[PDB]
Design a protein around this nucleic acid. Structure first.
Lengths: 293, 169, 125, 780, 243
RNA sequence: AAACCAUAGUUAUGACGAUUGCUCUUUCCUGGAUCGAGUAACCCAAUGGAGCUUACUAUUCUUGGUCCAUGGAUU
RNA sequence: AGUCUCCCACCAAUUCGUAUGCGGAAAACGUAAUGAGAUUUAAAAAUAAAUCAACUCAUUAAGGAGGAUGCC
């Protein structure tokens, strides 16, 4: 496939509401990304761990994909997922990842301290680990504590939206990216695009050009926003649709029928799938020995 | 794995480039004239600032950011202008380009920055510097009686730069 | 065993609005200031010597040929430059529609490709 | 614990001294901190033995072993601390005192089988005796029961339990010998055991594996004269001459196997030999183990007239190499009386360049138990430092003949060296004797070495000889005495022990051969070449995935013009194939029977009474291809295609008997040095230099320079035909004594005696690069 | 050894003579180049190929190498040579180079226009070719023009001097050097140095990088100042057998 | 005052060119000639050796087997 | 590559004097035959748990002589 894992939802925190112009800009850039050839699109959210989440569990995500972007999915046939990223600065601050991981589909944490880096690599349920590439990374990246979290269900993300914004941030971007590929041995990495407008978007032939210049080869950079991000989506989606990756609430055969490929068919409010009873006990047990589909 | 490095040993030559001088011709005098000390207005900060200036003009953002990630000035002496700089292994040629395309350090003018050797470990450039100083002292004490160079621009310096600032293991 | 001299591109985009896009870009003297500005912002004086040739510019679908050894430079900079109020108030951009190394692919109902085909072969001269 | 005493101690030094880290050959790593663990099979037996509760009253058939091993189990599991069986089993919770002391030890074993005859205990409290077979072979010496069980096929040397902890072992020829130590020693071996002048140490090798045969006549007349015939037949007419008999100088040469007993007879070389004559009717022979038996039984064809003692289990030897060798050996040897042969040994142990000494430097005397010294000690030699070349000439006239013979004849008699053990001391009683030196009567000496008794202590006969061809020192000693000496000899601060590979390297550097690997004209060298190395190489070749190894038959531009017989490389890929050399050279010679101008191939004459015509050289190559894999890979045949150079002259030769494998083709042994780049490995090929392009190669030898000023290397290398192959290289590596690559090998004899120059071309196996070289003969 | 063979001689034409300050500057810059490591040096000379060459067989090379610099060929080991840089613009105006062949060792050519450039590679007696990297080379030069001459015994030259004077000339230099490298497929390239002052000289182990990060393979950067520059000098000296 | 000693020896193992193999494959006549792509992943010495325990080769370098596993043809 | 074992001084006997299925100087070492078990167990987590394979455990001194089962 072709997948983009980051499109910033315009909002500071749970404090202020969103103006309509930002939403129209989001629609325009979403249509542009579709025009470039992207099938599955994420939508990020940036909150800090040191702030209260609302008590009422229903309002833990205001994206509301099913009824904000219905017509765009009708025409373009796009698939939209929600996502959350949490700022981690100091542990022993409460607000565990129990309920916030319930409403969302992907949970990620970016650390900005030594304690944050220690906490967010061995003893968390996250699936994406990201840094802030427009500043100074908190620690020299140890060669052992990063390669020993890839073997769990965690991956690293590179956002190139910082390489097209200003002049001073480019140096930090280059240095931090070189450090990350050097320390992580370049095994599990995915690429997003924090574009704030249609001008900043790039296609598959114009995202590999930048990254190939910072050390990463071409085939790996193609696999970056390929099946790897699909596996990230799979881990994100197998957390509220199954117990321990053993009993999913999914559907049957036929192309585009999975737990990630099917978004409209599954009633997420009740997590059930009512389907036509077309397969019974008194029918021949083979593919072609029975002919009726 | 572990990150590699390269060390560059750079000197500063102050050629006379002035008319109505008619110098003598001999291997001793040329070296004794070109190798005068630095006027002490240059510092450890001036060289670094000037080598950063010469990169973001003769190269762009993607040429001034692949070198500025790791670029540190370790040792510099004024009695003899020798200095040592450190950089990544794969991005050492760009620093050399910065070196040549740069003259007129700070406000001082009419000079040449001369990289003489590049090596991986730090233990070996020390031996190279010692051999270089020994060679210069031998060539300055062989043209004639040595004390005809009595001005002592450099003679008392090579012995006394032994390990005073070179204890950076 | 083999040798490659040129690399051919197919690149075209402008500001993603069409209300202002009616002010059509001039043939070449705006697709030459933009590229130089990009190759100067990204690489310095050493990023000026990239020699490129325009082959059959269009309304917007410009075609370019570049040295083999500058593919690293050119494609790295054109993809990271975004102008501002240069020729019009709307910033511009480029998207690389296609790349090739033989000039034998992706042309529709054209006569210009009859040139650049056989008369300008290597000729062993 | 006050630092004031530390300051007082350092007052015997500088203010703040600095000490170096240890040299890397004297460092060790920390082992575990918990006590050792027992095997489970020794735990279960002991547990079940203690848990067990307690018709001439013996009735002990096969139960004697059960009792005699239950006693050991009880003792072990009652003594050792590592034994952690369970909670109940204890020394007193179960009857251990009552058992095996008043139940088993005497009531059961003693009362069934009476002690067998030969209750002659020993003259020692350490098992030490002689194992010699008069006119017959001898078995393994008896010793510890556990470790004599593993010597059913491969014997042990006296020092095996010592070497096994510090080396890599192998198993060949009925011995478990030592191959190489466990450190890299390529350069240290050269500069401590080579012919350099930078030596400040020595190399000692335990060469006990070399047998020893003491043959002597029995006519009772000292003139003998029949052993002379046997020795002159056994080798060429060399080792029975005025130089070797009367002057009794050591001999080193080649030993044959005569069989003259009925009409037609011949001889076939076997290998090296060391023959030493004594009193004109006694001989000592030293042989490599492989050829030990074959010659021995030959002498047994005349034991009516001679007598032979297979004393290989009763005499041991050690070989010493280097400059400071005799200096180190002389630091661990003293005498009983005053003897001139120790005065000469004391004087000559101060040479440091042993090539100046004359042909003969035999020493022989009687030493004391070397365990008295407790530390190696110099010979107070620093006093005299004016040795000149005038006292050396005295060593050729002041030779103590009788004093050597008398001490020597205490080695060729089993009962004499049996008396040599008359009272061998245990370690504790020597310790007590040394302790008794703290209350001596002089009271102003403070001596450390124990005194020597006049008659209540043994005297060890000892012989030292010098080998000139190998340039080293033999020391010959009784077997069971070797271990006490060898323990001191390795406490010298700069003494190193070497294996068998280092011996090969040392003898390679000095431009000399090596019997196992480098004798392709002997019945066992041929086997080691074409049957033992080839399997070891092919087994690791064909057991690699294809494409991750050198493809041998797909190589381009090997020769100037290509014959379609062999697609790629010529001959076997894994060994120096001499059968192909014989067939190819013989066919090339026959192709010029009367048509001087050879011819390579005629384009498709035909395919083939089983006709095999001899028209084209491709036919010879396909004949060689046919003869292999279809005539000797499914059947057996033996022939020696490689003789050695003979003093006579039988060069030339010539539809009745024209086979290409019937006549041996004579060769010679050479050493080739490279004038330019190159690094000849094993099995590389040696071509003659073509008459064409001789000027180009001569110009390359003189030197062709670039405009820069350096040497010119990248030119057009011309190539020779396939019928220019004349030799092989059997050992080659970087030669440190000259700084350029060098190899040793063999070349066809008739090739060298027709060269208009002295250059050859060398190319490895699996490569097409031709390097230039010049060869010089080796007198072997 | 190191060979640098584009040190200019201060004279514009056959009329003027050399002053004192010019030679004084030349000696200083020669000494500096000797210090930096260079051993063999050649001295340039520019004419226009359309002027009245002196009729006599002397005074056509005013370098005067054996009287001047006599105290620099000893007291320090550097050796000096002589060369002339003809400027070709017209396909005519005679003065065939059979005359000046004996009076020099290296003869070069500096074509300006298309006719001159195609004449230069057609049939002359030069043994080296040079361009004006300062600004405005006649562009779109292809393998067709250069292949014939480089197949024969001709070499291309780079100067790198114009990269040190001003930025505006630096940009044109870096633009034209890429074209000349890629047109010849990295064959027969040598490096000189235009040193108009004792300041505009440089070492070796960096300028090789300056050419390597422009397109030349690292295997050829180590033979510019080296075997090729030695071979051209060797042939030029061996030409002296005319006598 | 040392004992300082390695055919990699101290956190060095660099920057590039020219041929031949191997795997796949476009057209053909350990078979031969052509058209075009790959030669990876896991990783790196620090006094040495003998063992064991772990990591890897997803039409993305390669080689060999077994299956009372599944689908087809034999019969 | 490692949170792991053994060796790199000697012992005629307060030092593993240990003939123990076979190899080994030794090893948290290798391998052969017969046989049996898996929180209900000698034991693992609350390797296996249809068959074969895998995990773990129990038993088995060498040489030589005598008689017989099977085939020449």
């Amino acid at each position: 496939m072709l997948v983009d894992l980051n499109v910033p939802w315009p909002q500071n925190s749970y404090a202020d509401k969103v103006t309509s112009q930002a939403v129209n800009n989001l629609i325009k850039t979403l249509s542009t990304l579709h025009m470039l050839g992207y099938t599955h699109i994420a939508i990020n959210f940036t909150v800090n761990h040191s702030e209260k989440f609302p008590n009422d569990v229903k309002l833990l995500n205001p994206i509301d994909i099913k009824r904000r972007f219905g017509e765009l999915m009708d025409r373009t046939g796009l698939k939209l997922y929600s996502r959350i990223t949490l700022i981690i600065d100091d542990p022993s601050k409460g607000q565990s990842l129990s309920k916030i991981s319930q409403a969302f589909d992907i949970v990620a944490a970016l650390p900005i301290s030594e304690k944050g880096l220690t906490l967010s690599t061995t003893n968390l349920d996250i699936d994406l680990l990201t840094f802030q590439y427009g500043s100074r990374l908190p620690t020299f990246l140890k060669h052992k504590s990063i390669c020993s979290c890839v073997n769990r269900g965690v991956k690293l993300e590179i956002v190139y939206g910082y390489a097209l914004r200003d002049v001073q941030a480019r140096r930090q971007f280059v240095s931090n990216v070189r450090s990350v590929i050097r320390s992580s041995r370049s095994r599990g990495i995915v690429i997003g695009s924090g574009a704030m407008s249609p001008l900043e978007c790039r296609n598959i032939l114009g995202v590999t050009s930048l990254i190939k210049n910072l050390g990463l080869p071409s085939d790996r950079c193609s696999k970056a926003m390929g099946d790897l991000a699909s596996l990230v989506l799979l881990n994100g989606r197998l957390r509220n649709k199954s117990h321990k990756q053993t009993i999913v609430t999914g559907g049957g055969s036929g192309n585009g029928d999975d737990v990630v490929n099917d978004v409209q068919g599954i009633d997420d409010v009740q997590t059930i799938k009512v389907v036509k009873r077309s397969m019974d006990a008194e029918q021949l047990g083979h593919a072609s020995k029975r002919h009726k589909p | 794995v572990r990150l590699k490095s390269r060390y560059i040993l750079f000197e500063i030559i102050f050629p006379p480039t002035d008319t109505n001088v008619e110098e003598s011709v001999s291997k001793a005098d040329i070296l004794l004239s070109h190798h005068r000390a630095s006027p002490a207005d240059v510092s450890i900060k001036s060289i670094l600032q000037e080598i950063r200036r010469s990169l973001s003009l003769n190269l762009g953002d993607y040429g001034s950011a692949k070198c500025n990630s790791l670029l540190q000035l370790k040792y510099f002496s004024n009695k003899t202008s020798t200095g040592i700089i450190r950089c990544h292994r794969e991005d050492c040629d760009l620093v050399i380009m910065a070196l040549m395309l740069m003259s007129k350090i700070g406000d001082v003018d009419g000079l040449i920055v001369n990289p003489v050797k590049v090596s991986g470990t730090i233990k070996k450039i020390e031996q190279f510097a010692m051999r270089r100083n020994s060679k210069i002292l031998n060539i300055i004490k062989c043209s004639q009686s040595s004390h005809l160079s009595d001005n002592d621009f450099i003679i008392n310096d090579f012995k006394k730069i032994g390990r005073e600032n070179e204890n950076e293991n | 065993k083999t040798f490659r001299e040129w690399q051919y591109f197919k690149l075209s985009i402008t500001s993603f609005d069409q209300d202002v896009d009616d002010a059509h870009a001039i043939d070449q003297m705006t697709w030459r200031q933009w590229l130089n500005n990009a190759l100067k912002r990204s690489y310095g004086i050493f990023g000026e010597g990239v020699e490129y040739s325009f082959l059959h510019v269009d309304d917007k679908l410009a075609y370019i040929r570049v040295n083999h050894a500058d593919k690293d430079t050119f494609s790295s900079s054109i993809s990271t430059y975004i102008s501002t109020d240069e020729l019009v108030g709307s910033p511009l951009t480029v998207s690389i529609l296609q790349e090739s190394s033989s000039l034998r692919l992706l042309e529709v109902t054209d006569d210009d490709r009859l040139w650049l085909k056989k008369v300008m072969e290597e000729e062993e001269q | 614990k006050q630092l004031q005493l530390a300051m007082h101690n350092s007052k015997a030094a500088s203010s703040t001294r600095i000490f170096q880290a240890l040299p890397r050959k004297l460092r060790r790593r920390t082992a575990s901190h918990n006590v050792r663990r027992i095997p489970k099979r020794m735990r279960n037996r002991a547990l079940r033995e203690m848990r067990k509760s307690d018709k001439a009253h013996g009735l002990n058939a096969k139960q004697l072993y059960k009792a005699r091993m239950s006693i050991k189990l009880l003792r072990l599991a009652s003594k050792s601390t590592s034994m952690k069986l369970s909670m109940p089993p204890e020394v007193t919770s179960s009857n251990c005192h009552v058992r095996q002391k008043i139940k088993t030890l005497k009531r059961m074993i003693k009362e069934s089988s009476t002690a067998n005859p030969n209750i002659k205990l020993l003259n020692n409290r350490m098992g030490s005796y002689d194992c010699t077979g008069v006119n017959e072979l001898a078995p393994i010496p008896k010793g510890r029961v556990k470790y004599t069980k593993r010597q059913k096929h491969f014997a042990w040397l006296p020092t095996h339990i010592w070497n096994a902890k510090r080396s890599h072992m192998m198993k060949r020829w009925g011995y478990q010998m030592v191959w190489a130590p466990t450190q890299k020693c390529f350069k240290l071996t050269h500069r401590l055991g080579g012919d350099t002048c930078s030596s400040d140490g020595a190399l000692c090798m335990d060469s006990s594996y070399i047998g020893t045969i003491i043959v002597k006549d029995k006519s009772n007349d000292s003139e003998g004269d029949f052993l002379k015939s046997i020795i002159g037949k056994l080798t060429a007419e060399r080792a029975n001459l005025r130089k070797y008999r009367e002057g009794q100088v050591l001999f080193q040469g080649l030993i044959y196997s005569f069989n003259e007993e009925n009409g037609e007879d011949s001889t076939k070389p076997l290998g090296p030999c060391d023959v030493f004559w004594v009193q004109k009717d006694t001989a000592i022979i030293r042989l490599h183990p492989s050829i030990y038996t074959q010659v021995f039984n030959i002498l047994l064809q005349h034991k009516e007239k001679l007598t032979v003692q297979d004393c290989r289990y009763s005499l041991a030897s050690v070989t010493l190499k280097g400059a400071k060798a005799l200096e180190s050996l002389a630091s661990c040897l003293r005498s009983t009386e005053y003897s001139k042969s120790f005065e000469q040994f004391k004087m000559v142990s101060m040479i440091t360049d042993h090539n100046a000494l004359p042909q003969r430097c035999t020493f022989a005397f009687e030493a004391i138990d070397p365990r008295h010294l407790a530390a190696p000690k110099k010979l107070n030699d620093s006093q005299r430092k004016t040795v000149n070349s005038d006292d050396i000439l005295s060593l050729h006239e002041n030779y103590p003949q009788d004093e050597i013979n008398a001490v020597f004849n205490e080695l060729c008699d089993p009962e004499s060296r049996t008396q040599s053990y008359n009272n061998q001391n245990t370690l504790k009683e020597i310790s007590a004797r040394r302790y008794k030196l703290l209350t001596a009567t002089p009271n102003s000496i403070n001596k450390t070495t124990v005194p020597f008794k006049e008659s209540d202590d043994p005297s060890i006969p000892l012989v030292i000889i010098r080998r000139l061809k190998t340039r080293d020192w033999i020391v010959v000693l009784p077997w069971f005495w070797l271990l006490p000496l060898w323990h001191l000899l390795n406490r010298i601060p700069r003494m190193y022990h070497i294996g068998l590979r280092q011996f090969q390297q040392i003898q390679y550097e000095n431009k000399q051969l090596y019997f196992p690997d480098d004798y392709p004209f002997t019945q066992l060298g041929y086997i080691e070449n074409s049957f033992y190395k080839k399997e070891a190489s092919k087994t690791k070749w064909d057991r690699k995935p294809m494409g991750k190894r050198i493809n041998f038959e797909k190589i381009k531009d090997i020769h100037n013009t290509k014959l379609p017989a062999y697609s790629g490389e010529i001959g076997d890929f894994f060994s120096s194939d001499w059968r192909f050399l014989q067939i190819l050279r013989n066919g090339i010679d026959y192709l010029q029977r009367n048509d001087k101008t050879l011819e390579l191939m005629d384009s498709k004459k035909t395919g083939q009474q089983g006709v095999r015509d001899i028209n084209c050289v491709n036919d010879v190559l396909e004949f060689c291809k046919d003869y292999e894999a279809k005539t000797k890979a499914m059947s057996l045949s033996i022939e020696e295609n490689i003789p050695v150079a003979l003093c006579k002259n039988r060069k030339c030769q010539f539809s009745s008997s024209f086979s290409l494998t019937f006549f041996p083709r004579c060769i010679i042994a050479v050493s080739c040095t490279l004038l330019e780049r190159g690094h000849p490995k094993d099995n590389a090929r040696i071509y003659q230099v073509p008459e064409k392009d001789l000027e180009h190669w001569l110009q390359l030898a003189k030197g062709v320079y670039r405009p820069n000023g350096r040497k010119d290397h990248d030119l057009k290398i011309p190539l020779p035909e396939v019928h220019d192959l004349i030799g092989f290289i059997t050992s080659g590596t970087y030669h440190l004594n000259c700084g350029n690559g060098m190899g040793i090998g063999f070349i066809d004899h008739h090739a060298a005696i027709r060269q208009p120059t002295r250059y050859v071309l060398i190319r490895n196996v699996g490569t097409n690069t031709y390097r230039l070289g010049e060869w010089s003969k080796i007198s072997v």
